[PDB]
From a paper:
We have previously reported the discovery of fungal natural product aspterric acid (AA) as a submicromolar inhibitor of DHAD through self-resistance gene directed genome mining. Here, we reveal the mechanism of AA inhibition on DHAD and the self-resistance mechanism of AstD, which is encoded by the self-resistance gene astD. Our structural and kinetic analysis of the mutant AthDHADs has validated the hypothesis that larger hydrophobic amino acids surrounding the active-site entrance enhance resistance to AA.
In this work, we solved the crystal structure of AthDHAD–AA complex with 2.0-Å resolution, which provides the critical information for the inhibition mechanism at the atomic level. In the dimer structure of AthDHAD and AA complex, the active site is located at the interspace between the N-terminal domain (residues 1 to 388) and the C-terminal domain (residues 394 to 573), formed by 2Fe–2S cluster and Mg2+. AA fills essentially the entire substrate pocket via polar and hydrophobic interactions. The carboxyl and hydroxyl groups of AA are coordinated with Mg2+. The β-ether oxygen of AA participates in the formation of hydrogen bond networks via W. Hence, the closely positioned [2Fe–2S], Mg2+, W, and the residues T216, E463, and D140 all contribute to anchoring the hydrophilic side of AA in the active site. Extensive hydrophobic interactions between the nonpolar regions of AA and residues that line the substrate entry channel, including M102, I177, V178, F181, Y215, and L465, are observed in the complex structure. Binding of AA expanded the active chamber by pushing outward the residues forming the cavity, including residues I177, V178, F181, G490, and E463. The binding of AA moves Mg2+ about 0.7 Å deeper into the pocket and changes the side chain of coordinating residues.
Author numbering:
A (entry chain A), B (entry chain A): 3 to 12, 15 to 574
Amino acid sequence: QSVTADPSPPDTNKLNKYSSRITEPKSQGGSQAILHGVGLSDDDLLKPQIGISSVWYEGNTCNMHLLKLSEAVKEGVENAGMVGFRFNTIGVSDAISMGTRGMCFSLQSRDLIADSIETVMSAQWYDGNISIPGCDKNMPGTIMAMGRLNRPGIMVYGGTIKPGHFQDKTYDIVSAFQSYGEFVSGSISDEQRKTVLHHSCPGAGACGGMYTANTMASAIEAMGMSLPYSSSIPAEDPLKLDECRLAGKYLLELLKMDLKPRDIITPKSLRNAMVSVMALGGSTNAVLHLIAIARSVGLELTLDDFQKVSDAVPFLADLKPSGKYVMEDIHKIGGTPAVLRYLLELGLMDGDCMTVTGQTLAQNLENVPSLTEGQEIIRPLSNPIKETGHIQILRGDLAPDGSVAKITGKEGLYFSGPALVFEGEESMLAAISADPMSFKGTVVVIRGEGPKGGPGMPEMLTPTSAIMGAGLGKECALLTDGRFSGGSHGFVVGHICPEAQEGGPIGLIKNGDIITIDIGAARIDTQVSPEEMNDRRKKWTAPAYKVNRGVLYKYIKNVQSASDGCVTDE
Amino acid sequence: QSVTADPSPPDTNKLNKYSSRITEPKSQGGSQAILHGVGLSDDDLLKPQIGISSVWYEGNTCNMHLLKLSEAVKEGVENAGMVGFRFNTIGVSDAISMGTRGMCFSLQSRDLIADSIETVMSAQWYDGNISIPGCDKNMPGTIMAMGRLNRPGIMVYGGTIKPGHFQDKTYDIVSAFQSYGEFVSGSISDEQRKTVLHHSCPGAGACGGMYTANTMASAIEAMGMSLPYSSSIPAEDPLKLDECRLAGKYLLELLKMDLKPRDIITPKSLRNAMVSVMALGGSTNAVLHLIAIARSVGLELTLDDFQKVSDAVPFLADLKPSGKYVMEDIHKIGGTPAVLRYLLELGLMDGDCMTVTGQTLAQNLENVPSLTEGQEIIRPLSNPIKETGHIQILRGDLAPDGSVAKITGKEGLYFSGPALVFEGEESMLAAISADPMSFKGTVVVIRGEGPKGGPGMPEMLTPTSAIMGAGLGKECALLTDGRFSGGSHGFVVGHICPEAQEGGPIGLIKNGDIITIDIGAARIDTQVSPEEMNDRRKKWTAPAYKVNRGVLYKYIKNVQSASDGCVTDE
Ligand SMILES: CC(C)=C1CC[C@]23CO[C@H](C2)[C@@](O)(C(=O)O)CC[C@@H]13
Ligand SMILES: CC(C)=C1CC[C@]23CO[C@H](C2)[C@@](O)(C(=O)O)CC[C@@H]13
Ligand SMILES: CC(C)=C1CC[C@]23CO[C@H](C2)[C@@](O)(C(=O)O)CC[C@@H]13
Ligand SMILES: CC(C)=C1CC[C@]23CO[C@H](C2)[C@@](O)(C(=O)O)CC[C@@H]13
Ligand code: FES
Ligand code: FES
Ligand SMILES: [Mg+2]
Ligand SMILES: [Mg+2]
């Protein structure tokens, strides 16, 4: 819990606790000369300095607008009497890289982003931070950096993309991904396929459903580290620019209070974040990212913590991918604060947690308009979509250190079938192409896709959509030490630990082993005896790492297990 | 030498070898929908995609102009028939962080930059790269990423800052750093001190002397990975913008030739780079960065390689800090190509190395105007400033795995003195404050500043300027496992390996040990017997790491020794 990462300030009530290190001593005249050179007056040197870290880049719709938002954040910082210094990190697009080896680089970019913002804040002695992520992994990456530094900070979510519309039909990135399967199946022509591709993503913003971006944005708001409505204002909405211009005012107040990320991110605000995930049907990736965020502030968060919140919180929101609505429809019925107000009224949330407004969650939500009368997106507690949360933690013989599944309650309580084992996604997809019926009734195992084996713990969508299009949805189960993206109508488990590369039982499974998934017992078991499994283990040798240089070899050297949130700095 | 880091392309003569992975298969319609959303037409999808990676940020003069350069690079990429996708990494300012704990974050940002550009190029499937660094570590960071990817790439140096001028007096960042010592000594008043600070850095650009930025920029041009004149055109010069607009034309040609970084960065172009360092009196940091660059392409480069080139190449350039002129004065006498033309004419360089112009170094230099008649910056081979290079590799008892020193030839051949040992820069500076005369005649050892002990292998300037201001310049020697920045008029050695944190002999030195530096034997020796040293070693226990989380704990876990270039991905 005693984190030692970044420099500590060189007194109370001082607003420039860190930048005074370089703006005040005569022995740092070199630093002051650079600062004059970038435009600071003598008066400016007395002011707090805010690092404004955006994740702009031009090759992704989620991120191409973030420089325009960064300009607005800087203008608000200046209007609040402080100095704004913009800088920008990298990010990668899951939508672009999905289905390719580029996806091996996606999860780790969260931790690269954390390292990047930490590096700049520490070296330049900035007093506070405003981050503008726009896309899946960007968000937890910025919060992790704020937790390590423990300097006042606010996350401004870039906002969600608007749905595409063409000829009385609604299209999104899900439409684009689905289009190829509908072409091969014969449902649509090549001409209809191309139309979907040209009208799926009309502008800037993150993916609209309850995928990782909106899950994490909502969760981070719920955790108190974004301003109210940050998660539900669309990316191109003029209110997003207004939020950007106001972050500086709110940050000034945080500096006056010295309200820091470790004052805001606590066991109870972490639970608030998890409640929001459960209630909205949020992504299983939130397990990885919330664990990493909790670790970044010196706290603990286990898989069991997620299971307890899941048991305690019903799934209430009729939102894609599980349901029919998108983040804009939440926005039109009162936004994320309206949802959280309802959950707080139900006693599911703790209102006493401090937030980046300088007030408590309860104080923020006191004044917010409630959910729109007659709305059908957020179900009553009396009529939930599921009595408990979607997220389910499975252990048992084959996942002794844990695993994560999204369970709707429609797949049944059990699946038993002979294992069909693949060393990588490629061999699985080839086998289901040549011989789809060989999959009927099996427990499909795609191993070697974990943090070290993948490497990079890639997300895989093609296995579930291939299973769906072969008519095998409820007829087989899918297990991996990596991650699955789309929903089957059957059992789909990821994050199996230990991963195959580490010699976990998943790497000892053989074709024909009878595997039994039991949701009530929360176990993925094998009919193979523990003694024969141990025999296989004694004979097992770890495969060679797939890379020997570069960022992914460093990831292999540094990354902890999926049950440990794949943190890299421990 | 067999590097496995990044994805390989999914045919010859194809110009979009990598982006075809996502622009051509119907199974990647999701990728194509994102690309349409960011503005690509169907015709645009057929074009090569260039990742344009700048290191812009607002808090440093070296980097604040790089977004404007990035816009020009993109416009040139489009004018050459390709698609330009801008993205931006982080960087840190050595001028701002020097003298503070922020400096522990500076060297590692080179390797963070390499990881960042590698990550984006791999995930987004870009065909080529144009990088726009502006500051010390940025430059080798971008080349390392290009070496790992081995996709056609060009480095555009951001260019050097113009000298500040006020009331018939020339000021630079060196003036600003010197100002405090001149205030404490009484040479100048507080009023004169403040004047230097306001007129030292008038605009955008890297430091003007032969510090790391200009050393590396020149070295990277000499290595063939920048266009001719990139290193010597000033940052605000309109020709820099013209260079930016032309990089796309040159990159198109590289894609047609499939001339890749591992075709350009070879043993012989690495030697060309080292020749340029020796001849210009370049920074000892170039030892670290050129080793890392050579490793990134699967090549070897040792400390002995530097000593052999140093022995073979005289110091010829009258350039700060060793001399009086700056990079702009090279620029006014024909620039870096004119210098390299002279060295090539002397037979010091290999002209057959391919470069990013698509032609050889000799072909580039055939047409360039020679050095301005009557110039006094570049000495003749008959009258060099030093018969061999400044860079000197020392081993011996106390640096068995090597060490690096800048030797002018003025300090003599020997120094012998009792050791005065400090565990960190702070205790050294306090001791020389309270008791300066206790330093007279000693060999000052500042240990625990290496890659893992510092951590971060920080650069330290205050020890040499404190020694200078106490009148002790030629009266003591300075040794460290970290790095020293400014020049003493005596012996100053850095990069001592193994570092103290790793239990190298430097961590076993005690106050009073007689240390003898012998330049001719190239040895740093101790009078203590090898048997007593081994006794000390058997009793020695490694100190606890100073951090336990964050980017610097990861650095500690990953970094190799200074003699190994402090690479992190092996
Ligand atoms: C960030 C780095 C490089 C550090 C090395 C060891 C210390 C230095 O002082 C200690 C620990 C610290 O608590 C402070 O007083 O500032 C924080 C900073 C770190
Ligand atoms: C399931 C399909 C159709 C997706 C559309 C684009 C994304 C949505 O969010 C992104 C990419 C994803 O990384 C997540 O957050 O889960 C994976 C899933 C796919
Ligand atoms: C970059 C990553 C994650 C890789 C994992 C193992 C391989 C895959 O194929 C091999 C090696 C490769 O030579 C290719 O044919 O493309 C390069 C890419 C890497
Ligand atoms: C020696 C003094 C006065 C310097 C002025 C600013 C810089 C120059 O270059 C930068 C910072 C440095 O990182 C290098 O490249 O060596 C260290 C040295 C100091
Ligand atoms: S790919 Fe960026 S939020 Fe979906
Ligand atoms: S600090 Fe950037 S080049 Fe000197
Ligand atoms: Mg994702
Ligand atoms: Mg430097």
